[PDB]
Design a protein around this ligand. Structure first.
Ligand SMILES: O=C(NS(=O)(=O)Cc1ccccc1)c1ccc2c(c1)N(CC1CCC1)C[C@H](c1ccc(Cl)cc1Cl)O2
Length: 164
């Protein structure tokens, strides 16, 4: 599961869960390798946000039902996403509906001002995505492949590291 590429994987989804819960789209490329993480946060401003208005009728069917208000309502979902991925589609655009589901669950966790429940929500997506793509994200570089399949808002090109 974990790799040196995982410092560029989890840093896309833990930062976009905070784009919709706290407004933070990031301005400083992320820990270790993170120039691809900056490029992917630019892209999710349109491709992630467009799915918060196309599939959010199904997100409320799993957030009024689950009423996610703890880290225990999130760590129980790390079994579920094994069966949602498998191949996950190699266009990477089908994974965006789980990333924008997680960003709307993170917004319901900021209605009660929690944040230690949104750290395991990024892992319930991404640590389980690199369980089912334990060599396929490593081979395809699927986080750059996500930016190359859209590029709709990465016209700034991301990159140029700051802080860590
Ligand atoms: O690749 C996907 N594709 S998509 O979502 O864009 C397919 C779709 C098509 C039409 C309408 C809504 C989604 C995709 C991504 C994420 C998903 C799912 C599919 N499913 C099936 C979806 C069709 C019914 C919802 C649900 C799954 C999930 C989330 C949370 C919990 Cl508690 C349980 C489950 Cl099972 O998350």
């Amino acid at each position: 599961m974990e790799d040196e590429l995982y410092r560029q994987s989890l840093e896309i989804i833990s930062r976009y869960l905070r784009e919709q819960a706290t407004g933070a789209k990031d301005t400083k490329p992320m820990g270790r390798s993170g120039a691809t993480s900056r490029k992917a946060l630019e892209t999710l401003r349109r491709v992630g946000d467009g799915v918060q208005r196309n599939h959010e009728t199904a997100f409320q069917g799993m957030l009024r039902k689950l009423d996610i208000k703890n880290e225990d309502d999130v760590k129980s979902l790390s079994r579920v996403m094994i069966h949602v991925f498998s191949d996950g589609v190699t266009n990477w655009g089908r994974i965006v509906t789980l990333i924008s589901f997680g960003a709307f669950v993170a917004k319901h966790l900021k209605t009660i001002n929690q944040e230690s429940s949104i750290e395991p929500l990024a892992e319930s997506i991404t640590d389980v995505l690199v369980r089912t793509k334990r060599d396929w994200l490593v081979k395809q570089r699927g986080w750059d492949g996500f930016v190359e399949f859209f590029h709709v808002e990465d016209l700034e090109g991301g990159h140029h590291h700051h802080h860590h």
